[PDB]
From a paper:
Poly(ADP-ribosyl) polymerases (PARPs) are a subgroup of four enzymes (PARP1, PARP2, PARP5a, and PARP5b; PARP5a and PARP5b are also known as tankyrase1 [TNKS1] and tankyrase2 [TNKS2], respectively) that continue the reaction (PARylation) to generate long chains of linear and branched poly-ADP-ribose (PAR) on target proteins. PARP1 is involved in repairing single-stranded DNA breaks making its inhibition an attractive strategy in oncology especially in those cancers that have defects in additional repair pathways. We determined crystal structures of the catalytic domain of PARP1 and the ART domain of TNKS1 in the absence and the presence of the ligands.
TNKS1, on the other hand, does not contain the helical domain, and its NAD+/ligand-binding site is seen to be more solvent exposed in isolated ART domain structures. In contrast, in apo-TNKS1, the D-loop is dynamic, potentially occluding the ligand-binding site, and must remodel for ligand recognition. Perhaps consistent with this logic, ligand recognition induces a rotamer change in the Phe1188 side chain of TNKS1. The TNKS1 D-loop on the other hand is shorter, relatively flexible, and shows multiple conformations of its glycine-rich region (residues 1201–1211). Nevertheless, we conjecture that the base of the loop is significantly more rigid because it plays a pivotal role in dimerization. The net outcome is a smaller and more restrictive ligand-binding site in TNKS1 relative to that in PARP1.
Residue numbers in the entry: 1105 to 1201, 1207 to 1314
């Protein structure tokens, strides 16, 4: 099944992942209700997710998307937060579980952090029922996402699948619209859970 390889903090690969995670934190419109109040994360560990079958499924779909998009799969590295992280690293993303019934990714780690415990932070951490828990270790993924031909929009366009000839939907920010970008796929084989990040949000002074 799945192997989790720990990255060393002194390794450039670990530093690249942590840097992308910390530098993409932003202030949210809810003032921190969903994901908590913090300026920085405390990274516990970063693991690379290895699974032969998941990799086959992802590479097979990447080839189809490339053929349908002028020989360009159009991959982006993006964050994902959800209460299904354990099922994802063993079974892969599954669409069966704003732009409708898709799988959502963000370029801002703090946006994904808002979904780690569910919609609007759900009921918070399982132990303390705290959306802003500074104690419990959280996890998010930093994924390879096959976007192919993306359908860009500034406002809600609810769909069950990407529009004809397209492979993903992108919600772009605008004043009066979305605060931050979101990337949506409608097939789980269009994302690979490359990195598993275990962390805490830090309580500011
Ligand atoms: Zn907790």
């Amino acid at each position: 099944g799945t192997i989790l390889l720990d990255l060393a903090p002194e390794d450039k690969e670990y530093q690249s992942v942590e840097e992308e995670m910390q530098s993409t934190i932003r202030e949210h419109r809810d003032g921190g209700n969903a994901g908590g109040i913090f300026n920085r994360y405390n990274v516990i560990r970063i693991q690379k997710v290895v699974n032969k079958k998941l990799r086959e499924r992802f590479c097979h779909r990447q080839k189809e998307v490339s053929e349908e998009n002028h020989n360009h799969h159009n991959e982006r590295m993006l964050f994902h937060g959800s209460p299904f992280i354990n099922a994802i690293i063993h079974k892969g993303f599954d669409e069966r579980h704003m732009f409708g019934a898709g799988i959502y990714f963000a370029e801002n780690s703090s946006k994904s952090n808002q979904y780690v415990y569910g919609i609007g932070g759900g009921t918070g951490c399982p132990t303390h029922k705290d959306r802003s828990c500074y104690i419990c270790h959280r996890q998010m993924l930093f994924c390879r996402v096959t976007l192919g031909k993306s359908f860009l929009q500034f406002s809600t366009m609810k769909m069950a699948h990407a529009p004809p000839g397209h492979h993903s939907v992108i919600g772009r920010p605008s004043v009066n619209g979305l605060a931050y970008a979101e990337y949506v796929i409608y097939r789980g084989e269009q994302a690979y859970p490359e990195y598993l990040i275990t962390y805490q949000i830090m309580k500011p002074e």
